[PDB]
Scaffold this active site. Structure first.
Site, PDB file in Angstrom:
ATOM      1  CE1 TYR A  26       3.251   3.061  -8.534  1.00 50.57           C
ATOM      2  CE2 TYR A  26       4.451   1.587  -9.994  1.00 50.57           C
ATOM      3  CZ  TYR A  26       3.275   1.950  -9.362  1.00 50.57           C
ATOM      4  OH  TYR A  26       2.141   1.194  -9.563  1.00 50.57           O
ATOM      5  CG  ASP A 139       8.364   5.967   2.647  1.00 57.84           C
ATOM      6  OD1 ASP A 139       7.748   6.554   3.558  1.00 57.84           O
ATOM      7  OD2 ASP A 139       8.084   6.092   1.453  1.00 57.84           O
TER       8      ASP A 139
HETATM    9  C1  LIG Z   1       8.819   3.895  -5.591  1.00 58.13           C
HETATM   10  N1  LIG Z   1       9.125   2.701  -6.383  1.00 58.13           N
HETATM   11  C2  LIG Z   1       8.285   1.618  -6.327  1.00 58.13           C
HETATM   12  O1  LIG Z   1       8.345   0.694  -7.129  1.00 58.13           O
HETATM   13  C3  LIG Z   1       7.244   1.601  -5.194  1.00 58.13           C
HETATM   14  N2  LIG Z   1       6.259   0.550  -5.358  1.00 58.13           N
HETATM   15  C4  LIG Z   1       4.937   0.792  -5.944  1.00 58.13           C
HETATM   16  C5  LIG Z   1       4.329  -0.578  -5.934  1.00 58.13           C
HETATM   17  C6  LIG Z   1       3.095  -1.027  -6.381  1.00 58.13           C
HETATM   18  C7  LIG Z   1       2.748  -2.361  -6.261  1.00 58.13           C
HETATM   19  C8  LIG Z   1       3.605  -3.283  -5.660  1.00 58.13           C
HETATM   20  C9  LIG Z   1       3.180  -4.708  -5.558  1.00 58.13           C
HETATM   21  N3  LIG Z   1       1.875  -4.878  -5.367  1.00 58.13           N
HETATM   22  C10 LIG Z   1       1.416  -6.140  -5.274  1.00 58.13           C
HETATM   23  N4  LIG Z   1       0.093  -6.292  -5.092  1.00 58.13           N
HETATM   24  C11 LIG Z   1      -0.882  -5.212  -4.980  1.00 58.13           C
HETATM   25  C12 LIG Z   1      -2.227  -5.678  -5.505  1.00 58.13           C
HETATM   26  C13 LIG Z   1      -3.282  -4.631  -5.235  1.00 58.13           C
HETATM   27  O2  LIG Z   1      -3.380  -4.336  -3.843  1.00 58.13           O
HETATM   28  C14 LIG Z   1      -2.144  -3.763  -3.385  1.00 58.13           C
HETATM   29  C15 LIG Z   1      -1.005  -4.744  -3.531  1.00 58.13           C
HETATM   30  N5  LIG Z   1       2.147  -7.263  -5.356  1.00 58.13           N
HETATM   31  C16 LIG Z   1       3.452  -7.073  -5.569  1.00 58.13           C
HETATM   32  C17 LIG Z   1       4.019  -5.814  -5.679  1.00 58.13           C
HETATM   33 CL1  LIG Z   1       5.721  -5.681  -5.962  1.00 58.13          CL
HETATM   34  C18 LIG Z   1       4.841  -2.819  -5.193  1.00 58.13           C
HETATM   35  C19 LIG Z   1       5.200  -1.466  -5.329  1.00 58.13           C
HETATM   36  C20 LIG Z   1       6.447  -0.737  -4.965  1.00 58.13           C
HETATM   37  O3  LIG Z   1       7.459  -1.167  -4.434  1.00 58.13           O
HETATM   38  C21 LIG Z   1      10.457   2.589  -7.092  1.00 58.13           C
HETATM   39  C22 LIG Z   1      10.232   2.655  -8.599  1.00 58.13           C
HETATM   40  C23 LIG Z   1      11.163   1.277  -6.751  1.00 58.13           C
HETATM   41  C24 LIG Z   1      11.422   3.720  -6.721  1.00 58.13           C
END
Ligand SMILES: CN(C(=O)CN1Cc2ccc(-c3nc(NC4CCOCC4)ncc3Cl)cc2C1=O)C(C)(C)C
Length: 344
Positions: A26, A139
């Site tokens: 991503y 998903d």
């Molecule tokens: C596929 N795509 C994404 O973006 C998919 N992903 C990757 C991602 C990685 C982190 C977080 C996130 N993580 C945390 N905390 C973390 C602290 C450490 O332990 C684990 C939790 N807090 C808020 C958020 Cl938003 C959200 C997402 C998400 O939706 C696309 C581009 C949209 C297609």
């Protein structure tokens, strides 16, 4: 500009003191100090513009999350990008910072039955809203369920989400599929494009099973092995459920397998609450037509301590709603969709 593990994070003035969280296909994710709201926040730098599928996934997510407003669904707080399409190489999506996710928690923590019950309630409450908007997540898995220190849960990652389309769900046997293998409903491998709400309930069933034991219930190693993990626990489908699979390749594959008996849930999960196992059974039903729906699951005796349909809101504005569009056109749509967050 601040740097994080090499990369530029062009997120100032508003967002400073960046700590690295993570990185994937991503993009890269950090925490950052929001100076307007005085809180740390999550920011994910997306760089999707050189490929049409990553623009597709980015735009779906943005459109859906900006329309939705729900306690058990991650929001978008802010979007940062360049002022012109020409200068826009990246989009940064600002979201509430969560402490962990269910994948990490399951690798390290035994969950009490009360925790399992509360997590399942929150997942289903969020999913009621999503499904009430005629949207499928597609998903659902532990790493897409974010958690804070008080165990509040939020569904994330809407990159594979679609508007429901049950009249166009049918396809052939062994049709390729994008979403995470271990959480795929059996029908994906047989005759389904994953365009009905029942695809999400199967995933939630898998998640509930994984909460009970800390291990994925159906960890298939490749496309068809996923189906035979499912059949190894559920046993051979009934004549009735077989007769709903009209496609001959899929039906004859199933007919070719030796008879397999059901593995009782209470032998897989000897310490589980019996009401949890009854709901699991109904979520992990082979026939998607017979599979429990989200609002029925919420009304199940296992969730009686939480169930309150007056406090399980639905979407005001469901999606009535593209797959053909060039990456240059999807950049334009992403530019337009993010314009509300610009100085102006
Ligand atoms: C596929 N795509 C994404 O973006 C998919 N992903 C990757 C991602 C990685 C982190 C977080 C996130 N993580 C945390 N905390 C973390 C602290 C450490 O332990 C684990 C939790 N807090 C808020 C958020 Cl938003 C959200 C997402 C998400 O939706 C696309 C581009 C949209 C297609």
């Amino acid at each position: 500009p601040e740097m994080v593990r090499g990369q530029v994070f062009d997120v100032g003035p508003r967002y400073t003191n960046l700590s690295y969280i993570g990185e994937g296909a991503y993009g890269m994710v950090c925490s950052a100090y929001d100076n307007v709201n005085k809180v740390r926040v999550a920011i994910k730098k997306i760089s999707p513009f050189e490929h049409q599928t990553y623009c597709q996934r980015t735009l779906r997510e943005i459109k859906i999350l900006l329309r939705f407003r729900h306690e058990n669904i991650i929001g978008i707080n802010d979007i940062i990008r360049a002022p012109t399409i020409e200068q826009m190489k990246d989009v940064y999506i600002v979201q509430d910072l969560m402490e962990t996710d269910l994948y990490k928690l399951l690798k390290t923590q035994h969950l009490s039955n009360d925790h399992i019950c509360y997590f399942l309630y929150q997942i289903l409450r969020g999913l009621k809203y999503i499904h009430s908007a005629n949207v499928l997540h597609r998903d659902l898995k532990p790493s897409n369920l974010l958690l804070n220190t008080t165990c509040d849960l939020k569904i994330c990652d809407f990159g594979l989400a679609r508007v429901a389309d049950p009249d166009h769900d049918h396809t052939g046997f062994l049709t390729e599929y994008v979403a995470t293998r271990w959480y795929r409903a059996p029908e994906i491998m047989l005759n389904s494009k994953g365009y009905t709400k029942s695809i999400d309930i199967w995933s939630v069933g898998c998640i509930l099973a994984e909460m009970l034991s800390n291990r994925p219930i159906f960890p298939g190693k490749h496309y068809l092995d996923q189906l035979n993990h499912i059949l190894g626990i559920l046993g051979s489908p009934s004549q009735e459920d077989l007769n709903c699979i009209i496609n001959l390749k899929a039906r004859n594959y199933l007919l070719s397998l030796p008879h397999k008996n059901k593995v009782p849930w209470n032998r897989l999960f000897p310490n589980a609450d019996s009401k949890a196992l009854d709901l699991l059974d109904k979520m992990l039903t082979f026939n998607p037509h017979k599979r429990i729906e989200v609002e029925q699951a919420l009304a199940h005796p296992y969730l009686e301590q939480y169930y309150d349909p007056s406090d399980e809101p639905i979407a005001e504005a469901p999606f009535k709603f593209l797959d053909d569009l060039p990456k240059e056109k999807l950049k334009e749509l992403i530019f337009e969709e993010t314009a509300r967050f610009q100085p102006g």
